[PDB]
Symmetry: D2
Subunit: 194 residues, 4 copies
């Protein structure tokens, strides 16, 4: 259920794994055995980030190992997003819009999944500003218009024109950027990070 | 480079890991030490599936541990597919088409990625035929028309109508099926397995 | 500083991954954009477990995804423990008054590794108490004496008498128990959870 | 039968995953659809490594993805080895005439686990030969005698004298070497690669 119940269970598991009783762990943390027992009873909700770091350190592990997974936001395995629900960020430079990021469905059961419908408002490939590469892989599909894609080394990019209906895979960590094809107005693509 | 060079390297690595010399391994396989040495020199290309199974067995591991990864088909991190390249399978029952699967870009660097543009030709939800669930997660986005989605238990499904622009996530192993909404003709969606 | 600095970096990365600016995230949390900026400037150390849970929730991920890995406690890839250094622990749960845990080297670079010299002071197999299995796999080696091992179904167990020098592998989740062989007084095992 | 039967199942699954019918795959391979059907009916056992490579290639995946995991050699989750059963191996590469490898229990359920009793017959640290590091992590325990360990840069190494009962962790890829301490004749270690 909660961060605190998750932590209570996982803390007890780890403490037992390294064969410490409450007193042994407490002696490493500037607490009483009673307080450690309280954490395992679900009373750790007010522990700070700093405190959690020290707990993980003395237990030879990470805060992540002591906290629950993201959770389950699915309806028997599925989640649906209607179009009007989409979060929207505008990619703006000096009060001029270059991209509109229309956010599609996401889920705590697969946190790396970030699908977007991207409206590409610049058709000047000079405006392409390289990112530093994504943490995960990405699948792209051109919905409207024509895309001018650049990738690799921002000072020596590989480039390609993608017509409507083209699809593309970009591996994790590969820097890239795109605009609409020179003079062609606007384009639209779906980008699925995963 | 090759299956055989990959195998030669990986076989040597595993043999060394379990501290066997050529003679020790050969004595387990009905071969000479010379033949084992030949495999590690790249001469294993004619080994059969059955033979590879026995080699993996005596080395306490899998055929996969002894064979190279899928390979690299990327162009500095990227691969692009033009629309006319798409492989196409028709979902047919008794010479009547129900689905057209239009295959988008794939890569050996992420073999589970299988993106499709799916043309949905049936608009009778009675025609929905449940699969048994996918091995991986799936992201769907309705491109045209309206989809009638069913999921979960084929004898008691959860159901939802997805308008154009709706998006959906279906977790691995969840059985599902879809048609166009009753009487609405045809629909189209993009489905990205990953 | 490690926890707050790592959180600052990972928070920024995730917020950017899901196309939120400071104001967007701030709104979802009921905070100001300046508060979010401060967290990304390393000022998140006093955030509570419960608060971290809410930040993870709105970002559709886990606290683990927003906090750094365990850290590095190795000396150019190695850590050593001298025999005088071992934590000597009485044990936890069922295995306390008749088992002494001499804790061997551990590292945050492999948190699941928990090696122990277990002094086994009970020689009554009849009184052996089953656990409910370990979270990970276990390798064991009989250092001294003779071990009476039991595993599987506590009501109808598999058993083995293991002389000095015997070795064993126990898969994750398999319930088991050990005493010294009947009447032999005591024995010692090295137990390596990994 | 395991290899051919597992291949039959995995081939079918993958072919279906990428929306190919028998004829589609057959064409890509230059075979008939009946040949592909026969493979999916368990008749692939005489397929060569090179042929398996071509099938994997056209299916955009690895041979590993098309072949079964190592298999199960456990007795209700456990495997045991008596001391009389150990393979005694002379060693490989640099570590042969002055090291005896007494191979401890292994399992296909954890193929990376390679535990050894290493009899260390050299007591000249000066002659210690570095490896280039192991593929996985290693835990060690000094069973007998006194070990002189070296690691890191062979030209300017870190070193430790490790009495009986000392324990050590060596991360993957870290070069290292051991002899007995100068003039002490011999020593024994348990080395657990995992
Ligand atoms: Zn991108
Ligand atoms: Zn599906
Ligand atoms: Zn155990
Ligand atoms: Zn080693």
């Amino acid at each position: 259920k909660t961060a605190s119940t998750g932590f209570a269970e996982l803390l007890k598991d780890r403490r037992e794994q390294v064969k410490m009783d409450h007193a042994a762990l407490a002696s490493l943390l500037g607490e009483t055995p009673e307080t450690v027992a309280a954490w395992e009873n679900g009373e750790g909700g007010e522990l700070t980030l700093t405190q959690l770091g020290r707990i993980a350190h003395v237990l030879g592990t990470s805060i992540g190992a002591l906290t629950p997974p993201a959770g389950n936001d699915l309806d028997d395995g599925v989640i649906i997003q209607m179009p009007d629900e989409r979060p929207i960020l505008k990619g703006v430079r000096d009060n001029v819009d270059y991209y509109v990021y229309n956010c599609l469905v996401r889920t705590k059961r697969a946190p790396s999944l970030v699908p977007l419908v991207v409206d590409v408002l610049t058709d000047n490939p000079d405006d392409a500003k390289f990112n530093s590469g994504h943490a995960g892989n990405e699948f792209l599909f051109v919905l409207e218009g024509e895309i001018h894609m650049k990738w690799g080394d921002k000072e020596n990019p590989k480039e390609a024109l993608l017509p409507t209906g083209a699809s593309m895979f970009v591996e994790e960590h590969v820097p890239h950027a795109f605009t609409a094809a020179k003079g062609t107005g606007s384009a639209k693509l779906i980008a699925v990070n995963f």
